[PDB]
From a paper:
The interaction between CM1 motifs and γ-TuCs has been structurally resolved in both vertebrates (CDK5RAP221–23) and budding yeast (Spc11010,15), revealing a surprising heterogeneity in terms of CM1 motif oligomeric state and binding mode. However, in contrast to the general conservation of structural elements involved in dimeric CM1 motif binding, the interactions are divergent at the residue level and the CM1 motif-containing α-helices are shifted by 8-14 Å (inner and outer helix, respectively) between the two systems to accommodate structural differences in the relative positioning of CM1-interacting spokes in C. albicans and the human γ-TuRC. Sequence and structural analyses indicate that dimeric CM1 motif binding to γ-TuCs is a deeply conserved feature across evolution, whereas monomeric CM1 motif binding in Spc110 of S. cerevisiae is unique among all organisms included in the analysis.
The γ-tubulin ring complex (γ-TuRC) is a structural template for controlled nucleation of microtubules from α/β-tubulin heterodimers. For ascomycete yeasts, MT nucleation occurs mainly from oligomers of the compositionally much simpler γ-tubulin small complex (γ-TuSC).
Author numbering:
A (entry chain L): 351 to 370, 390 to 417, 425 to 479, 494 to 556, 566 to 574, 586 to 608, 1474 to 1535, 1541 to 1582, ...
B (entry chain M): 4 to 19, 24 to 36, 39 to 54, 59 to 75, 77 to 107, 232 to 266, 271 to 492, 502 to 620, ...
C (entry chain G): 56 to 90
D (entry chain A): 58 to 92
E (entry chain l): 3 to 40, 45 to 54, 60 to 67, 72 to 86, 101 to 173, 183 to 221, 224 to 276, 288 to 306, ...
F (entry chain m): 3 to 40, 45 to 54, 60 to 67, 72 to 86, 101 to 142, 144 to 173, 183 to 221, 224 to 276, ...
G (entry chain C): 33 to 48, 51 to 81
Amino acid sequence: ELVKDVLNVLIGVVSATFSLPESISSLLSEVAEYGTCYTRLSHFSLQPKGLVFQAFTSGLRRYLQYYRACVLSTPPTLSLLTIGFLFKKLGRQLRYLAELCGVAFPTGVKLLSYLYQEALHNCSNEHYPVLLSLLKTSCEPYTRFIHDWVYSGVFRDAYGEFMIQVKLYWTHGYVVFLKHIAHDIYVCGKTINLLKLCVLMKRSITAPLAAHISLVNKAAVDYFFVELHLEAHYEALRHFLLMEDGEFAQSLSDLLFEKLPGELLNPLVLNSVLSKALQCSLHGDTPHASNLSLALKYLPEVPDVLSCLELRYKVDWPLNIVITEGCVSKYSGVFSFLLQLKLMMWALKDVCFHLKRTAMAGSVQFRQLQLFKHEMQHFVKVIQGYIANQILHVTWCEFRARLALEEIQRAHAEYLHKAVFRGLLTEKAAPVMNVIHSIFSLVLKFRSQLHPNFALMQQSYNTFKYYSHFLFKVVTKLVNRQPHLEDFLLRINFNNY
Amino acid sequence: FRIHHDVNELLSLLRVGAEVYIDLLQKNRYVTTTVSAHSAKVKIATPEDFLKKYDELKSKNTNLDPLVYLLSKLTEDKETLQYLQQNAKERAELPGTLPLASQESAVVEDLLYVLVGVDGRYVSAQPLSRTFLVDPNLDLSIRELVHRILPVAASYSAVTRFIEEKSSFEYGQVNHALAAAMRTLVKEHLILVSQLEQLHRQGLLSLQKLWFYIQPAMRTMDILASLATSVDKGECLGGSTLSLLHDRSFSYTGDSQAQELCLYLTKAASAPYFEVLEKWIYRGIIHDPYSEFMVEEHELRKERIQEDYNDKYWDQRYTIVQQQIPSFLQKMADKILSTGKYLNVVRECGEIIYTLKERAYVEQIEKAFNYASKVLLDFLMEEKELVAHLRSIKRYFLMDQGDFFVHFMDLAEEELRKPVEDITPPRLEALLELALRMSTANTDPFKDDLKIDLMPHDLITQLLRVLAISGLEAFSFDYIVKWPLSLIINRKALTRYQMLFRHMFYCKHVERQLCSVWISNKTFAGAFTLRQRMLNFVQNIQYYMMFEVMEPTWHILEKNLKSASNIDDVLGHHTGFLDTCLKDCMLTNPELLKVFSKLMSVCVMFTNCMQKFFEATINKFDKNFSAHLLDLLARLSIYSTSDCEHGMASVISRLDFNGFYTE
Amino acid sequence: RARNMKDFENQITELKKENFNLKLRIYFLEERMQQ
Amino acid sequence: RNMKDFENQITELKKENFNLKLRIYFLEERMQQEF
Amino acid sequence: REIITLQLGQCGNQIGFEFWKQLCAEHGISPEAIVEEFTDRKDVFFYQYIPRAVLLRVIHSILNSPYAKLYGNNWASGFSQGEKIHEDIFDIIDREADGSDSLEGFVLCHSIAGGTGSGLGSYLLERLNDRYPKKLVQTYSVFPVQPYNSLLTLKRLTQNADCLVVLDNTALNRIATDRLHIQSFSQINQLVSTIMSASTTTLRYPGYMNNDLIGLIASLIPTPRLHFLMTGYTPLTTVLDVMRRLLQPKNVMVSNHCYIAILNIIQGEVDPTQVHKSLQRIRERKLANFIPWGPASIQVALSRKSPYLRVSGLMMANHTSISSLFERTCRQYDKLRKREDNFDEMDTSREIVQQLIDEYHAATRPDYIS
Amino acid sequence: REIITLQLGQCGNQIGFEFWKQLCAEHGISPEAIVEEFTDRKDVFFYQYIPRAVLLRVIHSILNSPYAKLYGNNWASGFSQGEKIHEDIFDIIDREADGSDSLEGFVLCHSIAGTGSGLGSYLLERLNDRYPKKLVQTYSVFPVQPYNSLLTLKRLTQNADCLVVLDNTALNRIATDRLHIQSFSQINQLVSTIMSASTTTLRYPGYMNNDLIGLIASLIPTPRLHFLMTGYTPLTTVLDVMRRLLQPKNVMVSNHCYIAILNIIQGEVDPTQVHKSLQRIRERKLANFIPWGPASIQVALSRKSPYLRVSGLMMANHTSISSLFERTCRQYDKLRKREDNFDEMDTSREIVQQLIDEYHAATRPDYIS
Amino acid sequence: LSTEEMELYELAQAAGIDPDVFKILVDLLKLNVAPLAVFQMLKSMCA
Ligand SMILES: Nc1nc2c(ncn2[C@@H]2O[C@H](COP(=O)(O)OP(=O)(O)O)[C@@H](O)[C@H]2O)c(=O)[nH]1
């Protein structure tokens, strides 16, 4: 009857006619092509390299079993035309699945992306349920890995199929689904690992994911502020490195400058001046006050206004990540300039005391020189106030209300960058830094000449007045080309030109 | 200290400092790390030999994974291989007539008997890895499908041989529990075999039906067979077997079918190991029938520590054997040693369940460590107190009680200037007791632990030899303590107390004679100015030696012992106190001590000239002392500037207060 | 680039005090070899 | 002071530590072998 | 650096007692000189708690006060009294100085309203310069035979004291009558004690700028001859309100003319964001006149108020309008001269103050230099 | 080792007996020489407790006191009395020296102002010849009187190895400036505290200076310069104590430099700022010493009696003491010009002038030879 | 060389070294030293 012959080709078994009128041969040829793709798929997906590929193979085998179940179920024996028409709307779909597979082929995340693009390619057609079912059962290993960081956080890797693989402690490499979560997931795993050592709408995945990620991140931030006193370090850091604490700024500067070669650089003297200064600070003597070290980066051989000296804070493992090494380096840089500013106050106070002992001896020569000192003093004081206001008060107003894991890192870089920008240490304000250095040199020259050489003093003052006028001219021209610099001209110039 | 050997030996094997090369490893180091194998294997890949010979090593459970990663790194850098190759070369130089429809029942029914272990009519077992023969003439489809069902029979043969063999008494208790644990697993499989035997009589157990049915059993038999091969192919006992089971269980963490079976086997075979851990942690009793635990004991005589200096006892009584670590308690291995070690010393004077993903036992052992540490601390502080004994040893060895000593030299001055091996110990001991009774030392409950001893070497040369690598000076004190106290106060630390005393006694004695000279000439004129600078030096070094080194460090120790946590920190603090004290002394410096000892030799001989009662010798004495003192000041000034040490700065300020010796 | 210059004091004093402690061990054990 | 002598000084002290530690190792097995 | 205060006369003792009471209340210190359980540095004013106070009838009432545990009418007569007791008084001064680690200044609260404190103040300043040349001295003089004593002491003040803060009664009672409606001495001295505590706000509490007395005084004083100061305290609300309210004549305590230097202290927690905006508004509207010759600016500093005890504000300034008060004193001198052992030093005091009044009037001109 | 105290004159007996009450009160002993139960070395000043003192009309007042069971105006007249009681007094001295375990020093307290003046001068001459290897310590008290003082000073400056000056002019000064007494019953109260703390390190065991001998050779470099002053600040750290002792008014004295300064720190200060206190005083340059030979300043620590707050005592040996001797010299010249052989006073005049020359030249850079 | 040391040695030769050097390498790895540090040892030592 030939019904058993045609029905025993889609199963895979061979027949008398099927090895391995007259138009009926064409009809059998079409049915044979329907079975050869089934045989090719069975031969290709027999193995039970990648975990995602195994799940796809399991889904394909599950689908094939349904196809075998459907056949040899309804028709006991029907007409040859009837079986041809019945297996028409299904045979073409089988051929499409054969074209979808190899009968190279990607693996890992690439295969998941490739299948996803295939689903959108023919979403409207009847292949949507089949493609969706395969994609649902092919993402199972990936979902297990995603749930691993969410709950446990113990990284797992089978063959490196994923796009992600495995002091600074942040050397975990990272490099379709929405990109708003890929970076969030990657940083979420690191956060939970750190705490361990101390239509196509993807809604089912993000529904239980956003809530847990937010909970973990908030817990991590809360732990840093409460049980680690991170804010306490910042207020202590500002006290010491930025030299904001009184009776410690003056004490450290005074002791160092009292001496001035082979001295002042040995570890015996500089490691002890820090120890002595702490008691006079009266704001310290805590574990916070420890870890302060006077490091040196240059040894000069021998009027000058340069005295190189660093001051580096030290932190432990948990907070080494929050505070970067580069941030501490820039703290030393701004500290070195700010220490140089205090050099005037010690020297200017000394010459003020030096002139005090002269007093009987009252004439034009004495009073004329003292008016020069007052003019010298006012320029230093007025710019010192600008530095104090711009760096220690207005910038510190930000980052105090701003704070109330990666948020901490970005914010800290911005706070320091604004601090060094307002401090005129940026290369863009080099002419301002150059002209003040001339004033820096001129006043120390006035210090050197502690009335045998009054003409030299008068010449030095006149040079300063010209240089000060040049400073006002250059800053005024620079306004057209920095909102922070706008306040500087108001400080330097007030009821004058 | 084996790593320092490896770097030097490697430095001799190949041709090229070693100081930095070991610092890269000291900061990096019982923990074992793991790396990916597939990436390394493909990186290496005639590579074909590597791919087949590798599988043998992991079968033996051999410290394997880290080395494989190292080969991949060496392959990346070709120059390393070339140099290694160059270095290697340098060193070297009747179913046939039976219907096909009815043969299926016969085939499937005979396949039901081989599962039990009995040979079948057609499917038999070839005598010895087990192999089977089915039929010399059968249908191709039937043979191929039976061959699919064949391996379950071989797995059953392996496991039933494993349990029968591993029942011996010479393999440890952990092997017995492991063998007994799986006995229920094979029993359940036999019940399923019998259940399928009763189902087959109805004819509803086909060849295809059996193949689907054995699928849960196929994985169960496969995992049991793999465990049997792993244990058999490599000698595993004690913690080694537990580590293998734990590693296997963690490997199948993404299956959810082979993880529960491994978890149950591990938690059932860990009872012998966990049961003996309970008595080792809560008590100091170790049964140890076979060498399977991670702690072993070596028999050492207790009096060894008091007798000599070299033999270690604290680090030798109990040591870790690394092969037997269960691989999941390595992070707390050192604490476990402390628990038993602390309890063992105090016992002679007067529940844990295996869990997965849970650290309940980790917290359990920590508070057990806390209680064991706490009970030991109060044991030695409340009774046989430590602080009083240290105050007592400070009284005599460190000359705290000056009334005792000022009478001692004034009583034994004539019997200590005689040459060595000419004074008998009993006469010194009798004078010691008489002086102690007369002085205010009678208020000492532990006054009966001071014994006179005489050393064979002088202090200066002994210190010179140990850094470059008789008469009165031979005098030395000694102390005796009981065993529970002697653990921290031993010869390893006591010899520093007496070494410090020798310089202390010499400086005190020379000052006493020097002071006595002042009254001998107290009523030709240049000796007064020499004496003034002479006495002001010995007192100044004495004051610095005593009121800025002895007390400030001791007061730190007194505050430090009030917050102790375990005896390990107590001994570390005590050896820290002694070591920093010697550093703050004038010792531990070859150049400094040699000129100091030369000056002290000048000190003693000058006083001998005064009682001889010449003008040409006082100027020589002045010129010798001034040159020595100026050389002395130069060295400490250099040593206090290039190197940071507040003590040397203090003595320079203390010795000169008027700016004199400005050169 | 530049040393802390404070841990340098702590680092130098730890090694020197350790070296003397290690030196004192070799001599008391070498004399045992002679004895 | 040369800012380079510090590196040389540290290496010299570390040399006194490593070399002396090595001699300890050699002499330990001598005690084990002698007995 | 320890700072020691001195009180002279009944007026100085009264303001000094009120100054100590307010300062003690500012910190967590009980009236019985015992710290209570309840950052700030009390070591500068207090020594281990006893205050470094020296007091020279009224004393008996002071001892009767609960704070007991916190311790003629002619110029010539006052001079004679100091001479007879100079050694006794300087004995306690020297021992206090030796007990102090390093003295910085010498705060004095003396009155020149015809009392003996003016005579004692003249002697003490003379000897302090003689014996302590490196030690700064500052006195908070107050202004009312009265015309005589009010100007003889000016001879010594202009050549001995490095700094001087004037608090006349002409403007003090005006504020008391207006904003308090008093129509006593304690009612008018309480405001003065409030200025005294707020004057050294940057001294009690550590800060980056102006950590010591010489730091503040040097900026305001261009020449030792010009060593006069005036104070205001508008608390009686942003930075603009404080800055604007500190310039009206109703707030300045003084009976062309321009300023030389302005230092203002803000004791509140106001946001530093708007400090420069207030500075621009002051310059744009031009509420103040400065010197034309040299570049003169305005400076402001911030400090934290005591949490134990609202935005405060104090101003310190030197104005050439202070010359008006001196001309009034000199005019009373000339009128009283003709109305009634050699009267020689009495003349040179007039010459010296007339030299000072010339210098003030010569600093307004654009050619003051050279 | 043992010390026997000797008291001479009305002033000497009063100071010694007053010192004995203070020592008895500080120690745990009853006035009747019986230990009270209610650690410290007591063999120095007590015998198993009968004090080792040789009492010599003050004695009549003493015997009425509850401590009873515990035990003329010319220098020439005093010398004659000593010569005539030669056998009487030395009999008690000899019977005590043999009974002691080992004699090490003598304590002499007296005033150079009648009978004690002559007796004290004669006693030191005989003790040197009889006992040339025994230390003598004289706690002299300073107030006809010109000649008596110089005659006593002639013996003290060469026959007594040590001497401490205590003049009534300085005693009344502190008694008025810090005590407001306006009597002899109150000025000696400070003397008792100085005397009690004078040998506090001898009585209390300590790290150093547990023997009397070591407390002199540190301070006195040569037998000629053998004068030690006293100081007492408490009438707060060691630095405050150090600064206050050096203050000129504090010292018991009515260019110039020190020789050797000994400080006793009675307080319970932790022994960590004992060094930096010396460091800070060096930087500030609070005082100066001899420029020729090296000179050092030393400090010692002790503890209070728990049966009984920071104290301090200073031993000062400065060349400034020449002013007091020059004051005695100037009044001697005035008395001489205004009025057997009368040659002893001439010898006394020359020898003290040599001491003045030695004291004044001690500050020169070339004092040697 | 021990049997295990030779057992690991044969794979090293199979993958493509001095036997005494290899024994030291095995000893270092046995003492828990990380393999990455060992290569950085060799790289700075074989240069
Ligand atoms: N400072 C002080 N001096 C005293 C005391 N008692 C007596 N003196 C001095 O002793 C002197 C009297 O000596 P005096 O007894 O007459 O000598 P004597 O007759 O030889 O015994 C007086 O000048 C007083 O200065 C006292 O309690 N304190």
